[PDB]
Amino acid sequence: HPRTAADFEVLYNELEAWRLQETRKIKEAGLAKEQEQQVLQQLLHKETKLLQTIDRLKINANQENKEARIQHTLNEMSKHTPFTTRAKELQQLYNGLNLPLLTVDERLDVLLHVKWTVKEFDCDLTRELVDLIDREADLLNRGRNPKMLEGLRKRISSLFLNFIETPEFNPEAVRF
Amino acid sequence: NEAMKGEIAVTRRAAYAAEEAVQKLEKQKMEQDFRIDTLQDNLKGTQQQL
Amino acid sequence: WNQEELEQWALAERQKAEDNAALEKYRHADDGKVKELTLALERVSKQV
Amino acid sequence: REVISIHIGQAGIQVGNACWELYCLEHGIQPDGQMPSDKTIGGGDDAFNTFFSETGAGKHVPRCIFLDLEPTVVDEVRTGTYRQLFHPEQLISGKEDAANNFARGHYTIGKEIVDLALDRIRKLADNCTGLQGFLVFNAVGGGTGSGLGSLLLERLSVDYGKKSKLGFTVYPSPQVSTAVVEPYNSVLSTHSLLEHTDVAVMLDNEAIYDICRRSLDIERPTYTNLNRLIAQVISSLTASLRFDGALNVDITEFQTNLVPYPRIHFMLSSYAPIISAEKAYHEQLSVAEITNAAFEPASMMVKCDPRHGKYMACCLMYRGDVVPKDVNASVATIKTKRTIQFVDWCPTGFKCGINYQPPTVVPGGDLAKVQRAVCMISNSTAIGEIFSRLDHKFDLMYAKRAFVHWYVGEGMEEGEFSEAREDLAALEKDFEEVGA
Amino acid sequence: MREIVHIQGGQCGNQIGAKFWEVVSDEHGIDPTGTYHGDSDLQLERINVYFNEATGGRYVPRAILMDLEPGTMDSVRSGPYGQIFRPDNFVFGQTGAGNNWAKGHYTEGAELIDSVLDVVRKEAESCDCLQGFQVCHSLGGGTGSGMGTLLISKIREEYPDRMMLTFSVVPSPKVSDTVVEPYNATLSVHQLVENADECMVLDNEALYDICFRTLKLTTPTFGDLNHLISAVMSGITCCLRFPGQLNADLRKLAVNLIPFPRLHFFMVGFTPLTSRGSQQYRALTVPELTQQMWDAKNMMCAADPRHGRYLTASALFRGRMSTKEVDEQMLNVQNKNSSYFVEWIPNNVKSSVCDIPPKGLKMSATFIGNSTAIQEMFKRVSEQFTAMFRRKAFLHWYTGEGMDEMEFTEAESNMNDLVSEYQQYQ
Amino acid sequence: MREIVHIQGGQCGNQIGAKFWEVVSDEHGIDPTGTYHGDSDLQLERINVYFNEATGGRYVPRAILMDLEPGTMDSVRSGPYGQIFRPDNFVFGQTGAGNNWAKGHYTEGAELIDSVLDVVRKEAESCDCLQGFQVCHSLGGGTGSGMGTLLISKIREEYPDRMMLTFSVVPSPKVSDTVVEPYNATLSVHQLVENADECMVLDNEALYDICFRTLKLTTPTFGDLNHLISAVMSGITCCLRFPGQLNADLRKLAVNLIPFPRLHFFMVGFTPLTSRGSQQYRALTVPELTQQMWDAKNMMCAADPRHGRYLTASALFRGRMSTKEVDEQMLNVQNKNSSYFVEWIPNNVKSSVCDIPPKGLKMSATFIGNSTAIQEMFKRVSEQFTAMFRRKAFLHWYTGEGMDEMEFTEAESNMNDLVSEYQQYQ
Numbered sequence A: 001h002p003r004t005a006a007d008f009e010v011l012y013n014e015l016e017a018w019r020l021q022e023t024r025k026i027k028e029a030g031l032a033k034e035q036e037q038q039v040l041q042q043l044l045h046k047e048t049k050l051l052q053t054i055d056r057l058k059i060n061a062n063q064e065n066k067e068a069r070i071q072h073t074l075n076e077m078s079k080h081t082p083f084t085t086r087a088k089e090l091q092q093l094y095n096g097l098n099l100p101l102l103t104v105d106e107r108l109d110v111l112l113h114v115k116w117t118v119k120e121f122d123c124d125l126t127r128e129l130v131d132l133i134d135r136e137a138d139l140l141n142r143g144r145n146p147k148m149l150e151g152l153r154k155r156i157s158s159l160f161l162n163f164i165e166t167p168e169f170n171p172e173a174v175r176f
Numbered sequence B: 001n002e003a004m005k006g007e008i009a010v011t012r013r014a015a016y017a018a019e020e021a022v023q024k025l026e027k028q029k030m031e032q033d034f035r036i037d038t039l040q041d042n043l044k045g046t047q048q049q050l
Numbered sequence C: 001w002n003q004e005e006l007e008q009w010a011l012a013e014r015q016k017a018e019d020n021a022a023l024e025k026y027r028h029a030d031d032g033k034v035k036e037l038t039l040a041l042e043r044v045s046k047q048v
Numbered sequence D: 001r002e003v004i005s006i007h008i009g010q011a012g013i014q015v016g017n018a019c020w021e022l023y024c025l026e027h028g029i030q031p032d033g034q035m036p037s038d039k040t041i042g043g044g045d046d047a048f049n050t051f052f053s054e055t056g057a058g059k060h061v062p063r064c065i066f067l068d069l070e071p072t073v074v075d076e077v078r079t080g081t082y083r084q085l086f087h088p089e090q091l092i093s094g095k096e097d098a099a100n101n102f103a104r105g106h107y108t109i110g111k112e113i114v115d116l117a118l119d120r121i122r123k124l125a126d127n128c129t130g131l132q133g134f135l136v137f138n139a140v141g142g143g144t145g146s147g148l149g150s151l152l153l154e155r156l157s158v159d160y161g162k163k164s165k166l167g168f169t170v171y172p173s174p175q176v177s178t179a180v181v182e183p184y185n186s187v188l189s190t191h192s193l194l195e196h197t198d199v200a201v202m203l204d205n206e207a208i209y210d211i212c213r214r215s216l217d218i219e220r221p222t223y224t225n226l227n228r229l230i231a232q233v234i235s236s237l238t239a240s241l242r243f244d245g246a247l248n249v250d251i252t253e254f255q256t257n258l259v260p261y262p263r264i265h266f267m268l269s270s271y272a273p274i275i276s277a278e279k280a281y282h283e284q285l286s287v288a289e290i291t292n293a294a295f296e297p298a299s300m301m302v303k304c305d306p307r308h309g310k311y312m313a314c315c316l317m318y319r320g321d322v323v324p325k326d327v328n329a330s331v332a333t334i335k336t337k338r339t340i341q342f343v344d345w346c347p348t349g350f351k352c353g354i355n356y357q358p359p360t361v362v363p364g365g366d367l368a369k370v371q372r373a374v375c376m377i378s379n380s381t382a383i384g385e386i387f388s389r390l391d392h393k394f395d396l397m398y399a400k401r402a403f404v405h406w407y408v409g410e411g412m413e414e415g416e417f418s419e420a421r422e423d424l425a426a427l428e429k430d431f432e433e434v435g436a
Numbered sequence E, F: 001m002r003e004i005v006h007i008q009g010g011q012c013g014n015q016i017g018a019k020f021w022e023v024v025s026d027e028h029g030i031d032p033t034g035t036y037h038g039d040s041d042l043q044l045e046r047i048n049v050y051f052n053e054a055t056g057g058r059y060v061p062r063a064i065l066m067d068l069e070p071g072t073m074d075s076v077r078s079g080p081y082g083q084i085f086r087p088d089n090f091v092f093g094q095t096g097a098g099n100n101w102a103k104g105h106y107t108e109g110a111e112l113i114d115s116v117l118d119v120v121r122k123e124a125e126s127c128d129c130l131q132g133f134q135v136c137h138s139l140g141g142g143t144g145s146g147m148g149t150l151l152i153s154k155i156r157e158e159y160p161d162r163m164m165l166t167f168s169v170v171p172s173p174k175v176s177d178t179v180v181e182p183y184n185a186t187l188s189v190h191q192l193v194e195n196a197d198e199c200m201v202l203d204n205e206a207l208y209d210i211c212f213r214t215l216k217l218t219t220p221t222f223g224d225l226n227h228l229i230s231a232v233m234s235g236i237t238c239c240l241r242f243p244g245q246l247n248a249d250l251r252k253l254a255v256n257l258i259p260f261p262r263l264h265f266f267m268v269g270f271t272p273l274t275s276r277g278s279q280q281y282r283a284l285t286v287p288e289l290t291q292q293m294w295d296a297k298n299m300m301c302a303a304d305p306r307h308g309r310y311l312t313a314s315a316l317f318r319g320r321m322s323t324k325e326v327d328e329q330m331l332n333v334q335n336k337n338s339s340y341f342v343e344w345i346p347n348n349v350k351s352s353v354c355d356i357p358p359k360g361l362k363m364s365a366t367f368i369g370n371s372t373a374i375q376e377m378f379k380r381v382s383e384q385f386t387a388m389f390r391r392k393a394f395l396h397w398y399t400g401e402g403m404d405e406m407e408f409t410e411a412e413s414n415m416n417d418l419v420s421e422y423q424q425y426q
């Protein structure tokens, strides 16, 4: 399970070495002057399978690196100026949204807290953020499986992160 | 009592149809929510590129 | 007993119908958001 | 692509007598055998192949037998308006009636006529080339329909087996009835039809009375009206084979699409638009409202409420001027309708067939002449309800052993009574498990 | 001199190919009697691709018609331009199968394909240098899907180095016409993804909405629903028959549109599309034709093409134009919609032109896109298949014909993996 | 080249635009069939400011008809010059606002703007160099006052650097045709003050007085009023279409007549409007044109200029004149009426001359004045708004349609401060 471009480089280079050894064995066989091309095609198809697996691992690593580096930026947003204290509070709210909202009551409570916090500024983004908060609140109050409120929760989290990554809303975002 | 039981059965089936329709609509709603998420991610990326 | 049961099922169906109506209005609003997002992304890409 | 018809019992004979009238009227065959040589209505010399057979100098004979023990109705036909049309030996008349006695129609008297019936059915099949199956008509509340019908279904399955069997069975009604041994005969025919009839579609005189009272405004209908409109239904079902359309089907497809299980084939029929002659030029005819009328709960040929259960597979056979776009839209609307529900065992449960042929009403009839008509055949789970309401009265009768001395003196004991009762119970269990 | 053999199977295949043959015969300028009447000289120069002279101008089309029910051949022979197909090319059984992939692919695939292969082999060896096979059929039927698929496997085994263009119409979610649609679709896909060179998939509600909006027809019947597909089928084969600034054959299209041999399910378009009322108020030029091509409500598949990226796309233009503005328009579309185009390929769009527009017009185009948004047309069928197979509903009609549950498991696995790799490339 | 796209809204907008296109079509020589049937070469030189070339000399207007009821659309189609428009532009919701501003700005606007915006965007992208948008609407109806201003706001947010010149026919106090006129007009000007760019004010009472006295008409139908408004439109849009000894485009007129960004409600006239019993008697010269120009009883508004000082004035003449004569006439008027002109603005009059007078005539002129006398037209609507808001009359039909109770107060506040800002600079 890779996470670094260096480890991906290692995987790529060892795969290329494997390709070279396989084709060298095929060539040094020195036989099947008509099945040689079929063996070459099969070898290339094997290569394609492995490259697609590497691509899948790359997608997973990119997503996990994105999440980890957002958390890292939130941490660097903390390391006792009042702006940094507000940043720590917003980090707490973001972690509350991040954690698996396994309980509907705590879900509603944290949504209430973040709605109170957001409703202070109200220029353009809070309209859609409040709309999404009310959407989740209603679809939990009437009673629907939270496992079906996955994309909507993702959208709330994304909009809240975009709200945090803003100068006026978080009065230190000029850093990044 | 016979007519009342018939009405009970009809109303019960109507309620179950409503439930299944809501389930299907919720699935479609979640798919559209994924779509909105993707179209917002692309917009943020393009803004940063600009 | 049967009259009580009919009352119960009528209430349940009413609740489900209201849920469906709210979900439909949400879906239409999301479609409008789809259109506006597409337009905004187009314009920003052209500026880029 | 020919299908032969066999008509068993009084109800079957009368229904067939109406059906062959309608068919001869359609294909222009005169009531004396040959098509006129001066007036040429319609087209297609292969259009009459399915139901008739040409002989020599234009004398057509139908591919249908009329078998019965009691000779009354059979010789009434023999002396009636349809003398020349039928072959003289396709009409089989015994001597003594089965007389509401399933045993007397299945064991003692039956065995002496089925041999002749089969010896002629196989002759008819040999004359035919593209045999598409068999269609049977029988009243399960009688003696010839149940006994003779069960025996003949058994022997036809033993002989051919691999061909389809569409059976239009007249079950009794909830309250309307004209016997006392209806439950006994009906269950003893159910046990055999359940595992031999390839597709069993049900009828009910009470339901057809309701239909022809509300729609045709005939408040006092006899059996002729019921037979006429059932003939209309059969013609609408066979229109796909007999003519050409934008999207045509046949029997093989009809089973392949509407029978989700080897033992679940009990499907409600219906027809639309059932309209009198005084309102046909008032009401607007289009696929949306005719489909709604066909799906209307009090328009089922079987007196059972279809909202109770979940549909399995619906076949809408449209006839006349239909352009598939509007039937698709009507299909979407009817699937979005709130009161009807499907089952997750079948996500897509519609099938639409279309033929370019308007329905034909028999002169002096009651139905009006129209442009288009939909015949609907849907598999549902309220047939469990009809079987249950029959089973209650059957076991209530079997409590006191009433009317059973006739059976024990004619040739069956109580072993197969218990067997058929358990079989019907298993059928009800099957329906109740599958539906939900 | 390059030769295409056109096979048509099932009711869908029969009707669609009949419309295609009327359009092509009219465009090359031959009357239904069977003689030639093309005034120009550009028409005789390439009749050999679709027609063979029999004796004295009787240019018989090169086509194979196959199904199991007599009615379809009766209708085709009766219909206009149906007096030209050679009767010996009506290779045909007698019974009819109906909605049963297993019945049409196992039983009758024995006593009918044994002669269909003979007819195809004779017709192919009749010509000098083959170009490929062009076969039109459906996926939700029995006599076109299973029979056509077994024919595809047989002809791929026979002729390995030949193009294969499968014009296949796929079942629709909303447009319910039978219940065995998921079964037949999965079974057919399980072999198309294995053997078919490329599948130009089509459906029905997309075409219905096209006839509603882009043409404003009020009662769109099959006679025009298939006319659109006939126009597309004629327009794809433009280079093999007509000169132009930049010729491009089926091999060229496959090379430019198939990054991997399991990525060959194209969605198709056609421009211009306009109502007869407004055929007087619009300007016929590449700037409008290209915008019509790159539209969601203009494609002929129920997959919203923005729901993903385009792995590759192709445009085939017909009519005098400027290959500067054609290329500029293609690049403009790429740059404007860079979000909906995959990144690891530059110039995802190929554009080839020809100097001959279709008869009755002055300019035309055709769009062939291999995009990952076509995954939904398979996802819906896969989910329906899973829901139905969890209950073994309608299963006995296959199990008593000869098919087992292993075939269904394999079909589901291949369907899921190809959809998963479409999702990967996004 | 520089472009104007014409959006018509509501019943009044549809009728006015229909008459205006009837007028411009003959001013350029275009046959109502659609073809060109002119006489002079110089007509063709700028017909791309209003038209498109469809197929072989089929010049079609660049207009979008926008409304919620199809009755007026049917009437326009029936009327003459109907077969000139592109039927695609025809957009309508078929339900009807019913003179309900909230319904037309919140209920049906949200469902029909999604298409009308698409159409106007299509016209804009078919253009190459956009000068701006032209709009026609009313301020007393549901669609005209609500959906028109909603579309104006949409256009301003989309294209922020393109002008909009909009002809707004306003509800005069004594020719009222409905009861919610101020509730509509105030709410519409709420957004017209901050979105539009030139709100050219018109009213039917002044047109009625003109038809009574100057034209001496006895029974003036709406056709003649629409003709007068069309003449004003053509007079404004003439430097864009014909050469002249001086040039004044839309942007130049705006930048000259708008000193402060909230004073863009111009009031206009037209010369020479001659009764057909005096046209044979009067000899038309530049002094006659300027006399009828500054004649207060000819201005197409119920805002008498004797009560207000002029901030700016413009005169667009059409005809081969003497530029010294025109300028000295402007000077003479400015020196005679020495009290009606702002002291801190020297030479308040800007005059442009085009070389091609309108059809038939040999000399013409159009007056566009930005004076402070117009604030009477706003006082007379603010008073009525306060009158029907003091006891909450007719509020629920807007309250329950989507609007709150504070938008009306905001509209009243903007009326009050707008009147205050004219009073300040009077």
Ligand SMILES: Nc1nc2c(ncn2[C@@H]2O[C@H](COP(=O)(O)OP(=O)(O)OP(=O)(O)O)[C@@H](O)[C@H]2O)c(=O)[nH]1
Pocket (backbone or CB within 6 Å): D008, D009, D010, D011, D012, D014, D015, D070, D097, D098, D099, D100, D101, D138, D139, D140, D141, D142, D143, D144, D145, D146, D170, D177, D178, D179, D204, D205, D208, D223, D224, D226, D227
């Ligand atoms: N709907 C309808 N029912 C009919 C018709 N003819 C007979 N029946 C019904 O058939 C049912 C039972 O059949 P029977 O009348 O006993 O005649 P059968 O089936 O030949 O039995 P047996 O005559 O006793 O041998 C009766 O209850 C009738 O209601 C008919 O034309 N239409």
Ligand SMILES: Nc1nc2c(ncn2[C@@H]2O[C@H](COP(=O)(O)OP(=O)(O)O)[C@@H](O)[C@H]2O)c(=O)[nH]1
Pocket (backbone or CB within 6 Å): D247, E009, E010, E011, E012, E015, E016, E067, E098, E099, E138, E140, E141, E142, E143, E144, E145, E169, E171, E176, E177, E178, E204, E222, E225, E226
């Ligand atoms: N566009 C189009 N679709 C058709 C036509 N005929 C049938 N279909 C569709 O094709 C699907 C299945 O085709 P089918 O009739 O089973 O083909 P078969 O195997 O030859 O019978 C159905 O959903 C029909 O809606 C046609 O002529 N044109």
Ligand SMILES: Nc1nc2c(ncn2[C@@H]2O[C@H](COP(=O)(O)OP(=O)(O)O)[C@@H](O)[C@H]2O)c(=O)[nH]1
Pocket (backbone or CB within 6 Å): F009, F010, F011, F012, F015, F016, F098, F099, F138, F140, F141, F142, F143, F144, F145, F169, F171, F175, F176, F177, F178, F204, F222, F223, F225, F226
């Ligand atoms: N100039 C002119 N004004 C008109 C015409 N028809 C109506 N009006 C004016 O328009 C006002 C009514 O606007 P209305 O049609 O209700 O606007 P809508 O609700 O958006 O359609 C009335 O006060 C009339 O004076 C016309 O043909 N010409």
Ligand SMILES: [Mg+2]
Pocket (backbone or CB within 6 Å): D009, D010, D069, D070, D097, D098, D099, D142, D143, D144, D145
């Ligand atoms: Mg009898």
